[PDB]
Swiss-Prot record:
Subunit structure: Monomer.
InterPro entries membership: Scorpion_toxin-like_sf, Scorpion_toxinS_K_inh
Pfam family, one: Toxin_2
Family: Belongs to the short scorpion toxin superfamily. Potassium channel inhibitor family. Alpha-KTx 19 subfamily.
Protein name (database record): Potassium channel toxin alpha-KTx 19.1
Taxonomy of the source species: Eukaryota, Metazoa, Ecdysozoa, Arthropoda, Chelicerata
Annotated site residue numbers, Aromatic residue of the functional dyad: Y30
Native species: Olivierus martensii
Database matches in PROSITE patterns: SCORP_SHORT_TOXIN
């Protein structure tokens, strides 16, 4: 599974966030 900051962000924007990224292999949201 490839972690993408662009995909992560989209998941965060839809889940109520200001953005999102990807670390070692875990998506984080930009609350």
């Amino acid at each position: 599974a490839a972690c993408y900051s662009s995909d992560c962000r989209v998941k965060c924007v839809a889940m109520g966030f200001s953005s999102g990224k990807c670390i070692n292999s875990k998506c984080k949201c930009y609350k």
